[PDB]
Design a protein around this ligand. Sequence first.
Ligand code: HEM
Ligand code: HEM
Ligand SMILES: C[C@H](O)[C@H](O)[C@H]1CNc2nc(N)[nH]c(=O)c2N1
Ligand SMILES: C[C@H](O)[C@H](O)[C@H]1CNc2nc(N)[nH]c(=O)c2N1
Ligand SMILES: CCSCCC(=N)NCCC[C@H](N)C(=O)O
Ligand SMILES: CCSCCC(=N)NCCC[C@H](N)C(=O)O
Ligand SMILES: [Zn+2]
Lengths: 409, 411
Amino acid sequence: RFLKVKNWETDVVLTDTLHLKSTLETGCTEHICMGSIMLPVRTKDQLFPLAKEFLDQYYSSIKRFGSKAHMDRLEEVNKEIESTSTYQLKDTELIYGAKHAWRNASRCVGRIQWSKLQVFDARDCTTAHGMFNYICNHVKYATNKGNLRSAITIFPQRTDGKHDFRVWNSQLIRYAGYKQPDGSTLGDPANVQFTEICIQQGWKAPRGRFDVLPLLLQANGNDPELFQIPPELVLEVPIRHPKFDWFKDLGLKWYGLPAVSNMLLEIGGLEFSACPFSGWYMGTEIGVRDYCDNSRYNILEEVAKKMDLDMRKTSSLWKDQALVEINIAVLYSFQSDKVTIVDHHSATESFIKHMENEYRCRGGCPADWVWIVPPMSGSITPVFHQEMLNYRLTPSFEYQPDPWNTHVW
Amino acid sequence: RFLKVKNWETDVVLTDTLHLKSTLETGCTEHICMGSIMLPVRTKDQLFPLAKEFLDQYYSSIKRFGSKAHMDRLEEVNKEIESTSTYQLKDTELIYGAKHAWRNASRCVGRIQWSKLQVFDARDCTTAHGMFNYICNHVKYATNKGNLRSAITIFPQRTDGKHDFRVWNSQLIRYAGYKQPDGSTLGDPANVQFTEICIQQGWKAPRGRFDVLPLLLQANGNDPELFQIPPELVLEVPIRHPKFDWFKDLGLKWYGLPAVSNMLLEIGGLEFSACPFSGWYMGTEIGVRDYCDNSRYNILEEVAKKMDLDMRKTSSLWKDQALVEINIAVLYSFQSDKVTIVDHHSATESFIKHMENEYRCRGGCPADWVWIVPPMSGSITPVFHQEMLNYRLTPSFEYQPDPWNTHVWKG
Ligand code: HEM
Ligand code: HEM
Ligand SMILES: C[C@H](O)[C@H](O)[C@H]1CNc2nc(N)[nH]c(=O)c2N1
Ligand SMILES: C[C@H](O)[C@H](O)[C@H]1CNc2nc(N)[nH]c(=O)c2N1
Ligand SMILES: CCSCCC(=N)NCCC[C@H](N)C(=O)O
Ligand SMILES: CCSCCC(=N)NCCC[C@H](N)C(=O)O
Ligand SMILES: [Zn+2]
């Protein structure tokens, strides 16, 4: 029942008890581990125990468990669900919930920051036009001219499931991708399907390498509508290298604001299907994944060629050499433009300190090792050597089906 | 049931049915994943089904399932178990079993090679001296003057648990570590506890940075005895860099033969507690882990100092740059000396081909992503993008407690 986790570099052994508060399932069984798999309406009956569990955790957190106010709130919510089949969170409960969904995010290395989240309550939003305004304001607040600030914007909860709010985009800011007659892909290959949806919905595409996608916003279950983020709100960084003069000539850039927009926020049984949230980048996200994945911008070959590396043999490690240089350029370019970015050494060092705090104060920290370890230089970061237990606590950020697969027009 | 795994780079989807043959447990539950945890006398009653399921697997593999030879063999083993509480494997079954424990080893990226394994049957061994001789012969055979050959040597199985054969070394060839009174370590910090045991047992330690450990060998449950591997049988490689002439003056070297000696082989319910096996290195094992772990030789700072990298801030990626140069030097050195080694790109590419072949011919390939993904440059290797399923098939290699924790000393 009490579980131990060991760090193999330091020999420090921590004891996890928080996993006993675990609600959702992992995908693993006693017979099979599914730890490397990417992707492994609530009735009145279903909803009250979920509200109770959340309210109990909330009242505990402000040291008023079992109090008059605790018991009166539980009764109020019970009455509301029995009468209306749902209930509404107090602003304090929504802020607590969003912060804890971040705290519980087992795949996120940046959780040391969890209590410093700005929460924008957009539950009064009714139209897609309202959504666009709120999102532009999120974008401007979070960007803060390069001094990035963590934020979430929360739109109205699911009701009967026919009036969902949804941002159809996977992040607020992403680049278009276009299948060419050539057979190659122009832009970001990850976004080819979504760009096709936008064009079919009437977006006039510039058909370039780094075209910022419009937002496709769905309010109150209505058909989604198109909006362009004001260009002057989208901060972008040209990529250059501190030593290699030729790097700038590759014509690379990236955006400053990573803002995930397709996840679902579950708080006390309630489901917030449009809840875009943002922090700041870890450099390997752009330099390793977005630039060097074979199915992404796939620039390893081009950079290796400019460096004049021996590309005849895998064992010269030309791919590894070019990888480090691309990642040096990403960090240098963001730092020179004074746009917040974290390197993987500093980010993982932080997460370790966070994990230690969480073990001492909360009895544990759910963590998905497969996601926490950076996609380059894994064992030279401290998280590689750290045993982690993965489990699902609520409030939570959850994946949900892409809306074009689900939406009836 | 069918389970699907996807490659997120190619969109190839494979279907696993082999997991249905898994009986052993993982540590995971519907509520917790223990995927990154390093370590998560049998009765007659439990022994016959394990025997039977193994012999069913063996006979199917030779297309003789349900033959008279198969039925006669089950009857023979059943009678041997009923009367002696154990049984003896035939040589063919032992070879099949060792090959399959390797095929089934979910943490091994080198399994494309599984069907090429030289099996040395040492089940006639009775003493630690005889163990020493078997192991010297394994080292010479597997080394093959640098053209490495995979091999395993199998000592007698467990009987009552009071007569176990054990190699107390974690690998056949490893370097001593010495803790100094000032708290520093000379040599390999991984091997400090074991070195202390060797010295206590009588080893005259040279006290240098790369001292090959003596073997410490336990036969038939007796107290272990020390032996030195003949120096001429221990192939080593001086480390140098193709471009940086100062690299050689770091005074680095490593041994050619990686040979795991502390694991237990389970075949058909029988337990082979002493079963050293060897292959060849993937370069990151030495260059990333052995040299660059903070708790191992820890050379990153010294290498970066010599490269004149900006070390004031981690965001210059100085550790990453020095890491690549060290790994280049390891691969270059071994290749220059004609000692078998494989780079992490080659090894992971071959593993993906092996895995896809296994899915098609066997219905699956259990694999532990946490171990399979290399410790540098993970996502530029194809295994990072491959979903894998981890489960436990028999025959298998298992961890076992260190023998100094469990040994009853006779005196
Ligand atoms: C403040 C700076 C932050 C840093 C440096 C950071 C770091 C990261 C990184 C590197 C990833 C992996 C992303 C990927 O590989 O695609 C990640 C994932 C994630 N983060 Fe954060 N994070 C930050 C803020 C936040 C915030 C503000 C939230 C929510 C309020 C959050 C919740 C999540 C979630 C739910 C995931 C998993 C996303 C997915 O599954 O695709 N993080 N984080
Ligand atoms: C032919 C070349 C081989 C290569 C390139 C190779 C590669 C690897 C690597 C890189 C590891 C991880 C080692 C570590 O991080 O400590 C490993 C683990 C392992 N390999 Fe291999 N291997 C080979 C041969 C073999 C052989 C001959 C066997 C047994 C007959 C075997 C069975 C295993 C097992 C059981 C592990 C897990 C060890 C542990 O848990 O400590 N492999 N392999
Ligand atoms: C198949 C495997 O689960 C997949 O490639 C994962 C591995 N680890 C990851 N880790 C992070 N942070 N982000 C990712 O997208 C992935 N992809
Ligand atoms: C805690 C964690 O599981 C541990 O550091 C693992 C990670 N992956 C590994 N992978 C390999 N091949 N070898 C190892 O020793 C480890 N160590
Ligand atoms: C928003 C929650 S995590 C904080 C932001 C972030 N550091 N990453 C978000 C994902 C970005 C994606 N990996 C990309 O490379 O564009
Ligand atoms: C023997 C079974 S796997 C094949 C050999 C091997 N490539 N490594 C074994 C482990 C070596 C350890 N990581 C080290 O760096 O010394
Ligand atoms: Zn698991």
